[PDB]
Design a protein around this nucleic acid. Structure first.
Ligand SMILES: OC[C@H]1O[C@@](CO)(O[C@H]2O[C@H](CO)[C@@H](O)[C@H](O)[C@H]2O)[C@@H](O)[C@@H]1O
Ligand code: MG
Length: 580
DNA sequence: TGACTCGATA
DNA sequence: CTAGCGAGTCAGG
C-alpha cells in the first residue's frame, strides 16, 4: 500500500512545526559540497516532500532549519549538516539521530541506512537505499515519484521509531550516551570535516618526483639481483623469484601461495641482498601509491584542502574511522614517510598546528578498571610503564633493565591490552609459545588485579552477553559461548580489549565536547581539525599557542576522573610534522 | 567487481 | 594478540 503525502510546490506553516522527522537527502557517498536531491518532513500535521530548490530558497524554511527550538529527528544528521554548511545554511535542533541510536544499541548490525535501523524493530515499510539508488556504477537518483515516496517513507520510519529506540537506549543506560555524547560530537565532527586541512600540494608533488626516482633505482637493483624483470608488486610473481629462482627458505605460507609479508622478509634478509631491496621498494611504493597519489587525488583544486569524513557509526569499539582521505593512518614511525606530514599546514597566515596526545591512555584505563594496585601505583608515579613491566616480569632493578628487556615487556603490554595470547605474543616476539606463556604467567603474578579483571570480564561477557565501556557503550559477544576454540578465543580477546579501547574512545570524545565549549567561552579562534584515537590536532593563530598549551591538556586530562591521573603531552609547529 | 595479501595508524 | 582504510594484483562469477 502506497504512503500518502503532499508533494509541495511551496513551503507552508504546517511544515514548520516544532517537532518533526526531517530528511535532507544527499545521495553522493562523499557529501562534501554535494547536491541535496530532496527533502521530506513528517510531523503532527502530515507528510510532505519539498524540492530542494524550493525549500532551500525559502526564508521561512531556512530559518526553521536553524532554529534550535524547532526539534528534528533524523538519520545521519552530520551528512545533512555538512551538505548544508557548504550551502551556507545552518542546521540546529537535531534532538534524535537514528543512525547513532542504532549504532549504540548494536554496532555489529552494521546499520547504514534507515531500512536497516527500522528492521531492528520489525518495521519494514521502507526500502533500503541501495535498492532505490542502485549499487555504484548503476547508482543514480530515480525520478521524482520514486524519490519522493522513498524520502517520505524514511521520514515516516524515523517518526515512528524514535520512541522505541529511545526507550531501549534508556533501558541500556545509554540515553545520556546518545544525547550528551554522540549527538553533540556529531556537530563537532561536522565542523571539523567542513573546515578541512590545508595541504601544501607543491611539496607533495615534489616528494612524488623524488620517490619516483628512488623507486626506479631500487626497482632496477632488484631486477639485477634477481637476474630478470618481473612485477615486484605481485606477491605471486615475487614468491616465484624468491622461493623458486633464488631458493630462499619458505618459513610461512599464506593460503593461496607463498607468504611475502614484511615479517617473513625480515627473516630472509640474511640469505640474499635482494630481500632488503624488496622491503625498501615496498616502503617507497606504499608512500607513493597510497599517500602521495591518494592525497593529491582528493585535495580540492581550489582551496587545496582535504575534507575527510569521520564515520561515527562504524567501529565495533566506539572509535571513529576516517575516509577519503583517511587522516588517521598518515605515516609517522619511519622518517621517510613521516615527512609526508610536512605537507599538512595551517589554513591561514601566521597560524600554527597544535597537537595534544594522551600518554598511555589504554593502560591507564586498564589500571582504573582492574583496580590493580601495582599498575595504579606505577601511573601515580608516572613511571615508564614498559620499563616498569620489565622490572616486574624479569625480576630486575631499573638499572638492570636492558633495551631488549624493555622491548619484550612492551610487546607484553600490547598483548595485555589486545587480549593476551601465548600464540599471538610468540608470533610478535618471534619466540616459542611456551616462552611467551612464561612471560604472561610472570605478568599476571606481578599484576594480579589485571589477571582477575581478564578472568572476570570474560565471565561477565558470557553471563550478560555483552561487555561495556565507562560511558555505557556496549558490544555483544555471541561467540563467547562457541565450542570452537579459535572462535571463542577471539571473542574472549574482544571482551578483554573492548572495555579498554572503547573507554579510551569515550574519554577523548567527551574531551572534544568539553574542549569546544571552552574554546567558545574564551572566544579563541583555535579550532579542531582532526582526532586520531588518543590525540587531538588543532590549528590556531600563533598568538594563541601559549593559551592552548595550558587549556587543551587540562581539558583532556579532566574529561573524566579515574583512579589514576590522565596525562597529556603537546607540541606545536608550522606543519603537522613539526608539531612534535 | 570482489576475494586476497599487503601495510599504514593508534 | 585490538581497531581501522585502502592500494595492488588476481581470478572465479
Ligand atoms: O555519512 C557517513 C555515514 O554514512 C554511512 C551510511 O549510512 O556510510 C556512507 O558514507 C561513507 C562516507 O562517504 C562511506 O565510507 C560509506 O561507504 C557510505 O556507505 C555510515 O557508515 C556513516 O556513518
Ligand atoms: Mg600517545
Amino acid at each position: 500500500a502506497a504512503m500518502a503525502f503532499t508533494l509541495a510546490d511551496r513551503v507552508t506553516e504546517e511544515m514548520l512545526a516544532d517537532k518533526a522527522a526531517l530528511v535532507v537527502e544527499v545521495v553522493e557517498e562523499n557529501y562534501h559540497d554535494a547536491p541535496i536531491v530532496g527533502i521530506a518532513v513528517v510531523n503532527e500535521h502530515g507528510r510532505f516532500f519539498l524540492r530542494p530548490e524550493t525549500a532551500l530558497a525559502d526564508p521561512q524554511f531556512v530559518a526553521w532549519l536553524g532554529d534550535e527550538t524547532k526539534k528534528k529527528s533524523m538519520f545521519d544528521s552530520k551528512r545533512a549538516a555538512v551538505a548544508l554548511k557548504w550551502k551556507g545554511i545552518e542546521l540546529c535542533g537535531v534532538s534524535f539521530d537514528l543512525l547513532l541510536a542504532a549504532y549504540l544499541l548494536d554496532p555489529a548490525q552494521g546499520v547504514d541506512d534507515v531500512a536497516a535501523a527500522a528492521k531492528m524493530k520489525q518495521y519494514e515499510a521502507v526500502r533500503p537505499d541501495e535498492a532505490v539508488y542502485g549499487k555504484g556504477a548503476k547508482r543514480a537518483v530515480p525520478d521524482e515519484p520514486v524519490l519522493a515516496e522513498h524520502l517520505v517513507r524514511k521520514a515516516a520510519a524515523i517518526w515512528e521509531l524514535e520512541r522505541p529506540f529511545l526507550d531501549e537506549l534508556r533501558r541500556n543506560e545509554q540515553d545520556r550516551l546518545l544525547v550528551e555524547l554522540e549527538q553533540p560530537l556529531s556537530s563537532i565532527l561536522a565542523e571539523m570535516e567542513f573546515a578541512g586541512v590545508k595541504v601544501d600540494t607543491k611539496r607533495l608533488e615534489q616528494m612524488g618526483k623524488e620517490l619516483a626516482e628512488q623507486l626506479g633505482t631500487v626497482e632496477q637493483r632488484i631486477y639485477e639481483l634477481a637476474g630478470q624483470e618481473f612485477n615486484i608488486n605481485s606477491p605471486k610473481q615475487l614468491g616465484v623469484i624468491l622461493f623458486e629462482k633464488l631458493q630462499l627458505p619458505v618459513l610461512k605460507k599464506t593460503k593461496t601461495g607463498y607468504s611475502t609479508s614484511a615479517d617473513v622478509l625480515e627473516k630472509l634478509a640474511p640469505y640474499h641482498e635482494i630481500v632488503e631491496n624488496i622491503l625498501h621498494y615496498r616502503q617507497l611504493g606504499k608512500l607513493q601509491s597510497t599517500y602521495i597519489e591518494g592525497l593529491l587525488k582528493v585535495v580540492r583544486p581550489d582551496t587545496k584542502k582535504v575534507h575527510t569524513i569521520f564515520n561515527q557509526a562504524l567501529t565495533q569499539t566506539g572509535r571513529l574511522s576516517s575516509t577519503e582521505p583517511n587522516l588517521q593512518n598518515i605515516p609517522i614511525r619511519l622518517e621517510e614517510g613521516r615527512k609526508i606530514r610536512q605537507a599538512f599546514v595551517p589554513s591561514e597566515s601566521d597560524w600554527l598546528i597544535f597537537a595534544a596526545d594522551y600518554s598511555q591512555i589504554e593502560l591507564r584505563v586498564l589500571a582504573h578498571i582492574a583496580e590493580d594496585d601495582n599498575l595504579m601505583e606505577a601511573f601515580r608515579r608516572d613511571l615508564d610503564i614498559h620499563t616498569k613491566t620489565a622490572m616486574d616480569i624479569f625480576q630486575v632493578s631499573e638499572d638492570e633493565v636492558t633495551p631488549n628487556m624493555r622491548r619484550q615487556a612492551k610487546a607484553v603490554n600490547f598483548g595485555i591490552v589486545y587480549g593476551i595470547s601465548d600464540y599471538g605474543l610468540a608470533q610478535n616476539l618471534n619466540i616459542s609459545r611456551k616462552e611467551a606463556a612464561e612471560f604472561i604467567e610472570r605478568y599476571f603474578e606481578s599484576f594480579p588485579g589485571v589477571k582477575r579483571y581478564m578472568e572476570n570480564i570474560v565471565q561477565e561477557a558470557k553471563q550478560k552477553g555483552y561487555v561495556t565501556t565507562l560511558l555505557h557503550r556496549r558490544r555483544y559477544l555471541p561467540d563467547i559461548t562457541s565450542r570452537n576454540f579459535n572462535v571463542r578465543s577471539f571473542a574472549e580477546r574482544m571482551a578483554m580489549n573492548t572495555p579498554i579501547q572503547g573507554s579510551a574512545a569515550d574519554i577523548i570524545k567527551k574531551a572534544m565536547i568539553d574542549l569546544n565549549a571552552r574554546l567558545k567561552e574564551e572566544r579563541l579562534q583555535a579550532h579542531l581539525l582532526l582526532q586520531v584515537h588518543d590525540e587531538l590536532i588543532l590549528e590556531a593563530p600563533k598568538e594563541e599557542m601559549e593559551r592552548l598549551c595550558r587549556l587543551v591538556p587540562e581539558v583532556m586530562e579532566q574529561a573524566v576522573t579515574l583512579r589514576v591521573p590522565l596525562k597529556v603531552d603537546y607540541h606545536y609547529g608550522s606543519t603537522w610534522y613539526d608539531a612534535k
